[PDB]
């Protein structure tokens, strides 16, 4: 009620490094809110138009099993995969597309906890391993805000482990508004999920203990209103009453490669806007 429209014009792409190196890889994380929806929405056409080298998707609500047909209209990407909830229920998910062919992939944080849900792909390449996450909402009333601490602590150490053996890039949806300046409304968030002290503690955690920098914000520390979610609901996108949900963070070694991070927030298929990171590796 309080808010009117805040502008965001995302700065245009910087594909060269501060050394003069050419970006040689472009990874495009995307929370499409149902892999089906999004399909119906024309997600897809971003993705055609992005010709991103590695696309990651979370909230897919859907099992490797019973992928739509869709995803092989996609030719540049044609090494899949996808992880879902062991129950085998349409909910969570992520899924990690890619030009080549990683060394491995594996699903999960190597805690059977934590393991469940459908929520972590780890795809290692030759120079760093990528990781892509659907992190747990602390729901509403914050009923799931003890359990959310967990994930936070068990995924730390998880990153943390990794990291002490290649360079890490890690993107999706976090799940946290990390500072005042990542959402529109901090004043009325403090008690909602997304904006807990709990939960922005745990995210300045995980930069710490890796530890991570968080590649939007290491470009541009100072620039408001740039936001990737806004609630579907009394037009929150039109008035650009959003939230930083969805991150790329870059292990410190990975910096001088990097050439830019990008928010897309005209693209349309989900409450959630793609995100996209250039490399000069």
């Known amino acids: 009620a309080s808010e009117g429209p805040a502008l965001y014009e995302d700065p245009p792409d910087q594909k060269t490094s501060p050394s003069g190196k050419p970006a040689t890889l472009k990874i495009c994380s995307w929370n499409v809110d149902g892999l089906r929806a999004w399909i119906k929405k024309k997600g897809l056409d971003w993705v055609k138009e992005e010709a991103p080298d590695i696309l990651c998707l979370q909230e897919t ?153 968080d590649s939007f914000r290491h470009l541009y520390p100072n620039t408001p209103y740039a936001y990737t979610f806004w609630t579907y609901m009394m037009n929150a996108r039109s008035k650009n009453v959003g939230w930083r949900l969805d991150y790329f963070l870059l292990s410190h070694s990975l910096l001088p490669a990097l050439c830019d991070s990008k928010i897309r927030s005209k693209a349309l298929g989900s409450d959630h806007c793609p995100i996209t990171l250039y490399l000069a590796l």
């Open 61 to 213: 609500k859907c099992s490797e099993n019973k992928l739509p047909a869709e995803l092989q209209e996609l030719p540049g990407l044609s090494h899949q995969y996808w992880s879902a909830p062991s129950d085998k229920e349409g909910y969570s998910g992520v899924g990690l597309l890619s030009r080549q062919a990683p060394l491995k992939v594996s699903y999960g944080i190597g805690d059977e906890e934590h393991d469940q849900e459908g929520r972590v792909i780890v795809a290692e390449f030759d120079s760093f391993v990528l990781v892509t996450a659907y992190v747990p909402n602390a729901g509403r009333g914050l009923v799931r805000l003890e359990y959310r601490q967990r994930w936070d602590e068990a995924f730390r150490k998880f990153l943390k482990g990794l990291a002490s053996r290649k360079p890490l890039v890690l993107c999706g949806d976090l799940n946290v508004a990390h500072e005042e300046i990542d959402l529109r409304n901090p004043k009325g968030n403090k008690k909602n999920a997304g904006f807990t002290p709990q939960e922005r503690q745990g995210f300045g955690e995980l930069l710490q203990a890796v530890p991570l920098a």
